[PDB]
RNA sequence: CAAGUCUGGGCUAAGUGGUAAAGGAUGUGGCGCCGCGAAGACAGCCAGGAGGUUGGCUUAGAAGCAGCCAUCCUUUAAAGA
């Protein structure tokens, strides 16, 4: 029933619940009345998001690097994430920094999946 | 705004902080007084086109401000003033300007753009009543082109102290038309 | 270089002091600017 | 791993599609024949593409709604452009029409919105010498 | 390497590409300077977060009612999403609702948490 | 070589003093402006180094990174005529 408290109420409210109250109370004043709340609360969602990357309650896929499929693999992490061509393929070279998750915010099911697919496809992947 | 001096004391005055400007007001004038420094500020603002006062002993705080000067010497620095005021119902010396915005027609498109001789008027609509902006552009420029005093297009106030056909601006060859 | 008329080249060509002396030195050879 | 603009119903110009993706890393008359199969279906208007080729010294992949600008071109009906822009400024072309094309463009272009997409309209048509007026 | 193309990586990227990518991003034009593309980056989170709610890699610990021992439970729910006191308890008695989501946008093992705090406070929890 | 290595408050560190002009250059020392540090600020560092932009003459190649003309739109962390 205070300010420090709304802040406190956005702060934890769980990556999805910033991001899903985001759309709604912006739903309440619009992408042009609203802009104060909501807006912020996504950053607020991103701090929670990697909240759950640090912790584990939320896996990051990432590419380790390619070998002797590095056309088949690109198709795979293009098709997975929806990075355009070229943007595909830079950052499928990049698999082998630590960024190099190449889909992150993936459940266990999900993440363990997207792993599976860029393995197969002719890379080595790890989660997390 | 403030102000003040007014014995009889040019040289030092033009010396310092305190550049020197006569109190004139129809009927009576008093030594000089004000100081570079203000001027500075205000004058900044705005000379003979917006328009405050000074609240010296409070004395009477009444506008008007400048009706001559000239930021004088060589080094481009003012010093010695022309102060007046207006508390009548009379205000006639009206000079304030008007401006446009840049109406693409000459130039947005034929390069072509235009001479401005005028830029400020001297009329005297309604007293102690003059836009601090007044604007006035029925756009419209190119080729042998130009526009003046007549045609002007006035507001409200209706005086024109000056006279039709002349200098307003013109559309001419930046390069050519 | 010209001994008289130093004026940096390269976005980034620095004006350096050596012996009162007014050097420039950037990243390139194509620079050496020496008064 | 390269991007490229080329011309429907055909493929492989010696000149523009032989040097290029064929050293970069392309099997130019495979990918241009590939190709032709697709700029079938709207042959006579230039569509561009972005062919990437990862590690058999082959492949191709997409095509994205072509260059606004030129593509309005196309619609309106004029070759080359007046010879500049703003300058010359003379080819007076309509909303409307503008704005369905637009419409159509939506793809490769701008998210999928009205007022953005036919806003780019005018600003290519602009860039070119096409006026929205 | 389009804006279609950039609509659709923001799009797929799950809600937590979403909402760290934001933060990020933000991070590079300021909550101040910035604004367009992780702000509305942020409604498409609401909608991946959403699409995870739907599918069932994340889940929704739904409160069924309270029974002998809402006092407790409040408790419970209270501290568990950091919702002030008159606030929590109003939910608290929605809890039969479909949106009597106590927590919302928890994991497998998070969730199974929640939905057995607000059980032994005294209340009937159940998860999706 | 007769007379304060006077005392007082600044600025010089080049012997300037012991000749020079145009023209240089975060030298030094004194005075006014625009942008902020808890939208916690410039150089450090992490990073995406957005898309319709690859528009016209010349193309044979402008598609910022041949040059002559533009300088818009944008989905969204902005934008980079």
Redesign the interface.
């Known amino acids: 029933m205070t300010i420090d408290e709304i802040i406190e109420a956005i702060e934890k409210l769980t990556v999805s619940e910033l991001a899903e109250l985001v759309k709604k109370l912006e739903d309440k004043f619009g992408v042009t009345a609203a802009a104060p709340v909501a807006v912020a609360a996504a950053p607020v969602a991103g701090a929670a998001a990697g909240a759950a990357q640090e912790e584990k309650t939320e896996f990051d896929v990432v590419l380790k690097s390619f070998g002797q499929n590095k056309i088949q693999v690109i198709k795979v992490v293009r098709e997975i994430t929806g990075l355009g061509l070229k943007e595909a393929k830079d950052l499928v070279e990049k698999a082998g920094s630590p960024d190099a998750v190449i889909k992150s915010g993936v459940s266990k099911e999900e993440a363990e999946e997207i792993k599976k697919k860029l393995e197969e496809a002719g890379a080595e992947v790890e989660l997390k | 705004m403030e102000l003040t001096a007014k014995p009889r004391t040019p040289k030092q005055k033009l010396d310092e902080s305190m550049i020197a400007a006569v109190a004139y007001n129809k009927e009576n004038n008093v030594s000089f007084a004000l100081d570079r420094k203000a001027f500075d500020r205000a004058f900044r603002q705005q000379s003979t086109t917006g328009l405050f006062d000074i609240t010296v002993e409070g004395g009477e705080t009444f506008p008007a401000l400048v009706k001559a000067v000239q930021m004088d010497k060589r080094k481009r620095a003012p010093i010695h003033v022309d102060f007046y005021m207006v508390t009548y119902g009379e205000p006639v010396e009206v000079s304030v300007p008007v401006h446009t915005t840049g109406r693409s027609q000459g130039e947005?498109?034929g390069?072509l753009v235009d001479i401005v001789v005028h830029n400020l008027q001297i009329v005297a609509p309604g007293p102690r009543r003059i836009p601090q902006e007044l604007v006035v552009d029925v756009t419209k420029m190119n080729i042998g082109d130009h526009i003046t005093a007549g045609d002007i297009k006035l507001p409200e106030g209706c005086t024109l102290a000056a006279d039709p056909e002349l200098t307003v601006v013109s559309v001419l060859p930046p390069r050519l038309t | 270089k010209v001994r008289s008329s130093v004026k940096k080249m390269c976005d980034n060509c620095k004006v350096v002091r050596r012996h009162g002396r007014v050097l420039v030195i950037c990243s390139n050879v194509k620079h050496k600017q020496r008064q | 791993q390269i991007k490229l603009q080329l011309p429907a119903g055909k493929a492989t110009p010696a000149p523009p599609v032989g040097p290029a993706l064929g050293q970069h890393g392309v099997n130019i008359m495979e990918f241009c024949k590939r190709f032709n199969a697709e700029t079938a279906d709207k042959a006579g208007m230039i569509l561009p593409v972005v062919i990437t080729v990862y590690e058999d010294k082959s492949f191709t992949f997409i095509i994205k709604t072509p260059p606004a600008s030129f593509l309005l071109k196309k619609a309106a009906g004029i070759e080359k452009g007046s010879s500049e822009p703003?300058?010359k400024?003379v080819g007076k072309v309509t909303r409307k029409q503008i704005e369905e094309i637009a419409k159509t463009k939506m793809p490769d272009l701008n998210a999928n919105s009205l007022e953005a997409a036919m806003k780019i309209i005018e600003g290519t048509a602009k860039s070119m010498g096409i006026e929205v007026v």
């Open positions: 947005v498109q390069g | 703003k300058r400024i």
